[PDB]
Design an enzyme around this catalytic site. Structure first.
Site, PDB file in Angstrom:
ATOM      1  N   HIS A  47      19.507  99.934  41.002  1.00  0.00           N
ATOM      2  CA  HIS A  47      18.069 100.753  41.365  1.00  0.00           C
ATOM      3  C   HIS A  47      17.654 102.378  41.979  1.00  0.00           C
ATOM      4  O   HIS A  47      19.048 102.224  41.864  1.00  0.00           O
ATOM      5  CB  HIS A  47      17.241 100.195  43.034  1.00  0.00           C
ATOM      6  CG  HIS A  47      18.735 100.032  44.118  1.00  0.00           C
ATOM      7  ND1 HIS A  47      18.899 101.631  44.773  1.00  0.00           N
ATOM      8  CD2 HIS A  47      19.446  99.376  44.673  1.00  0.00           C
ATOM      9  CE1 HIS A  47      19.855 101.753  45.219  1.00  0.00           C
ATOM     10  NE2 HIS A  47      20.188 100.472  45.645  1.00  0.00           N
ATOM     11  N   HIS A  93      22.710  96.785  41.666  1.00  0.00           N
ATOM     12  CA  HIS A  93      23.161  97.762  43.018  1.00  0.00           C
ATOM     13  C   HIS A  93      24.492  97.617  42.505  1.00  0.00           C
ATOM     14  O   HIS A  93      24.997  97.473  41.789  1.00  0.00           O
ATOM     15  CB  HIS A  93      23.185  96.551  43.724  1.00  0.00           C
ATOM     16  CG  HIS A  93      22.309  95.683  44.592  1.00  0.00           C
ATOM     17  ND1 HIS A  93      21.053  95.631  45.283  1.00  0.00           N
ATOM     18  CD2 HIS A  93      22.139  94.223  43.947  1.00  0.00           C
ATOM     19  CE1 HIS A  93      20.573  95.383  45.202  1.00  0.00           C
ATOM     20  NE2 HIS A  93      20.839  94.114  44.738  1.00  0.00           N
ATOM     21  N   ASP A  94      24.742  99.172  42.795  1.00  0.00           N
ATOM     22  CA  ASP A  94      26.813  99.714  43.338  1.00  0.00           C
ATOM     23  C   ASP A  94      27.132  98.466  42.933  1.00  0.00           C
ATOM     24  O   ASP A  94      28.082  98.437  42.194  1.00  0.00           O
ATOM     25  CB  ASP A  94      26.801 100.513  44.285  1.00  0.00           C
ATOM     26  CG  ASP A  94      25.965 100.086  45.566  1.00  0.00           C
ATOM     27  OD1 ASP A  94      26.080 101.096  45.975  1.00  0.00           O
ATOM     28  OD2 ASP A  94      25.869  99.186  45.522  1.00  0.00           O
TER      29      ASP A  94
END
Ligand SMILES: [Hg+2]
Ligand SMILES: [Hg+2]
Ligand SMILES: [Hg+2]
Ligand SMILES: [Hg+2]
Length: 410
Positions: free
Chosen positions: A17, A303-304
């Site tokens: 994101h 996400h990461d």
């Protein structure tokens, strides 16, 4: 004129994101610094309009990029079922999917599909959390500690320079945690004040203490920078060397918790399956979300942790020039399938596309003339490569088939 010997036929982008406000504002966070943390224009963990813009820029760039590669038309909205956008149920991932679409095909209103139940977590982004599968506690504990050099203590001990740098930025010495210290016989130290322990459970792994605090705090400093706030870290971060030193504490926690194979393979299986199926030639069908695969372009807002899990599972390692966070906001793990015109053989290429911390800070628009950073990745375990160094479809499929954990597939 020399003509391209390879033709881009499919793209799958796993993106983190965009820039968001910190996810928390705890009592610990205020006790390690005498200064007041700057406030954000959105709710905690939500995407900021600036974060949306930065994502839109990448969307704009990918459109120009894909047009030049001939996969998408230069004009008009992409044809029906040509572009598919999926996103985790979080506000920040949903909005990232919308920001990318808007940048990729303005006014075209491409749909951002998510799991139907948005109040329950989506296993595609972590099969552990929902119970689809479990972690082998003992084995995970041994693998993480092993990669840590035997103990978290030796791990932190090797990064005291980075930890003291963080304390400097926090003016930790004049903090409440430090001042109300009972054992003031010794010097204030984050790693000492907050011993870090490894906690492993069937559905989760975490690091308590300074390791996780440091990892979160440094990420927040980067966010402030990317967000364009006046003085990230209260103006105490003045050069690239300091940015790297601080972020190293962030990448370090991810190395242990998200890259470790014993956690990564399981946690990335659902995504590994979606990626392979999307890249493998087939007649327009499903895999979930009411979206038809294969197609031309699949964008996944995650996400990461997902980027790191995939890196760990696929044995992909990288460092991003101009970007201290290895899994930065908006960062994209790009999977492409190219066909060799000469013999119609299929090949897969993996890259990591991202905006340097400065391109974020300056909110610099992206285009073919001013592209985002990019690093071509090499699948470590791939034998059958082509001239450009891409892995064969069969090779890649073999890699995915061995890395995945069937008990974790959806
Ligand atoms: Hg949908
Ligand atoms: Hg399919
Ligand atoms: Hg596809
Ligand atoms: Hg991050």
């Amino acid at each position: 004129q020399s003509e391209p010997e390879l033709k881009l036929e499919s793209v799958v982008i796993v993106s983190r994101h965009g820039v968001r406000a910190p996810t928390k504002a705890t009592q610990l966070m205020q006790d390690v610094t005498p200064d007041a943390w700057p406030t954000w224009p959105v709710k905690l963990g939500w995407l900021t309009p600036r974060g949306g813009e930065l994502i839109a820029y990448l969307g704009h760039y990918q459109r120009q990029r894909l047009v030049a590669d001939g996969l998408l038309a230069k004009k008009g909205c992409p044809q029906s079922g040509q572009v598919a956008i999926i996103a985790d149920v979080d506000e920040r991932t949903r909005k990232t999917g919308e920001a990318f679409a808007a940048g990729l095909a303005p006014d075209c209103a491409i749909t951002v599909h998510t799991q139907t139940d948005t109040s329950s977590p989506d296993p595609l982004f972590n099969p552990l959390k929902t119970g689809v599968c479990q972690l082998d506690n003992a084995n995970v504990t041994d693998a993480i500690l092993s990669r840590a050099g035997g103990s978290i203590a030796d791990f932190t001990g090797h990064r005291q320079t980075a930890f003291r740098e963080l304390e400097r930025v926090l003016n930790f010495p004049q903090s409440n945690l430090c001042l109300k210290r009972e054992k003031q016989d010794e010097s204030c130290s984050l790693t000492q004040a907050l011993p870090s322990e490894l906690k492993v459970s069937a559905d989760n792994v975490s690091l308590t203490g300074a390791v996780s605090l440091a990892s979160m705090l440094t990420e927040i400093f980067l966010l402030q920078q990317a967000q364009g706030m006046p003085e990230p870290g209260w103006g105490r971060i003045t050069d690239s060397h300091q940015w790297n030193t601080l972020l190293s504490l962030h990448n370090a926690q991810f190395y242990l918790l998200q890259r470790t194979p014993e956690v990564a393979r399981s946690r990335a299986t659902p995504l590994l399956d979606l990626i392979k199926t999307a890249l493998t030639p087939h007649p327009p069908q499903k895999q979930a979300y009411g979206v038809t695969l294969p197609t031309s372009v699949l964008f996944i807002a995650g996400h990461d942790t997902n980027l790191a899990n995939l890196g760990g599972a696929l044995e992909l390692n990288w460092t991003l020039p101009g970007q201290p966070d290895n899994t930065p906001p908006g960062g994209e793990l790009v999977f492409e399938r190219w066909r060799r015109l000469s013999d119609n053989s299929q090949w897969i290429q993996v890259s990591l596309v991202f905006q340097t911390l400065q391109q974020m800070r300056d909110k610099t628009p992206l285009s073919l003339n001013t592209p985002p950073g990019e690093v071509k990745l090499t699948l470590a375990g791939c034998e059958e490569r082509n001239a450009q160094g891409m892995c064969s479809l069969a090779g890649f499929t073999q890699i995915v088939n061995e890395a995945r954990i069937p008990a974790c597939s959806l």
